[PDB]
Write a protein that binds this ligand. Structure first.
Ligand code: HEM
Ligand code: HEM
Lengths: 182, 182
């Protein structure tokens, strides 16, 4: 895909009002990078501890991990990716750039040897594992149900459609890029 | 993808009411196979004549094509695919089987040498070329605007989301299967 096609799932799964909600709800958050950090700490410590080694935090106490370079780097990168993606979708309506960003990010992960070897739709999809923790943990902050016009049901459904579309496009772009590289 | 995942784009782009509309509007049609036939006749004769050779109708007058085996066979297969897909989506809510059907069909086309050689997202996407003629020609039958509760705008938007999702999933499944086969 070039990115400008009419089949863009971010245009199909989300309408204009949905995209505005994604941006406005994300912006309502105070310290979104801190929330992203807390969720990644849960991912590597509680949910998928195989990821500690990947991020170089297999020895760091939970309390030191945010300072370790690969781990704190990833938190920054993931936060920036969500910042840009929600802005493109919900502010500029740059639907092409939003789709292109997600597929480029999916393809780029093929360089991660852990994922090249272990990413597997039959067994573990690590993009799904990570984003599912966001679905469970980020959405209650976004609805205001948890702390650190739109109804709770609306915000929940929109963020689920959005985050599931991020999973599917990163998964598909990764899988294709890996197949091509062989 | 197994098919049962939460990232299924037919569940994300279409809600239950949308899927019911897809099924009810398709069922309102009198002789849907005839309409499918007429649209394929336009595709091969007027829009993408490179396809005449593929379907063995490079000599048949337009008036004989429906009887030629590869061409009339394809019309039957495409009609059955839409019949099953709209039933799965809109009647049984078998969203897994709907997604699986579309990806299996995408993968199966890699066996078509014309597509293996020529299918190309940079240049011509033949699934997109075919389905776009359906978007232009089938939707006015579905809305009742042309001849052979839901508003015209609703029916048009739902069928566009649906048919665009069929294009994207056939395209992606095809591309992956071709890359794997090499
Ligand atoms: C789940 C959705 C994910 C998103 C949105 C995401 C986002 C990003 C971004 C934006 C970058 C830098 C730009 C780029 O390389 O494309 C990056 C790099 C990286 N990603 Fe991810 N990532 C995700 C999941 C994962 C997973 C499951 C792994 C497991 C290995 C992973 C490992 C890495 C690593 C090691 C880097 C290099 C930078 C670093 O180590 O901090 N990512 N990721
Ligand atoms: C655009 C969406 C399309 C749909 C939904 C579709 C559907 C189907 C189905 C359901 C079958 C039989 C089952 C299977 O093999 O999976 C089939 C076979 C086939 N498809 Fe397609 N098709 C599409 C596009 C195309 C295109 C663009 C070509 C161009 C080569 C093509 C060429 C063929 C051929 C040659 C067969 C074998 C049967 C025959 O020749 O009649 N199809 N297609």
């Amino acid at each position: 895909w070039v990115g400008n096609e009419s089949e863009n799932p971010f245009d199909l799964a989300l309408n204009k009002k949905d995209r505005t909600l994604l941006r406005e709800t994300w912006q309502r958050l105070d310290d979104p990078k801190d929330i992203v950090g807390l969720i990644f700490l849960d991912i590597v410590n509680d949910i998928e501890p195989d990821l500690k080694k990947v991020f170089g935090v297999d020895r760091a106490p939970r309390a030191a991990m945010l300072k370790m370079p690969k781990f704190g780097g990833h938190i920054l990168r993931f936060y920036e990716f969500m910042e840009q993606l929600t802005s493109m979708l919900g502010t500029s309506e740059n639907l092409t750039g939003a789709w292109q960003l997600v597929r480029k990010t999916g393809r780029s992960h093929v360089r991660q040897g852990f994922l090249e070897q272990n990413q597997n739709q039959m067994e573990k999809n690590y993009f799904e594992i990570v984003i599912n923790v966001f679905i469970e943990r980020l959405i209650p902050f976004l609805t205001g149900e948890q702390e650190l016009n739109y109804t709770t049901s609306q915000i929940t459904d929109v963020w689920k459609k959005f985050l599931n579309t991020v999973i599917s496009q990163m998964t598909d772009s990764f899988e294709l890029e890996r197949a091509k590289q062989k």
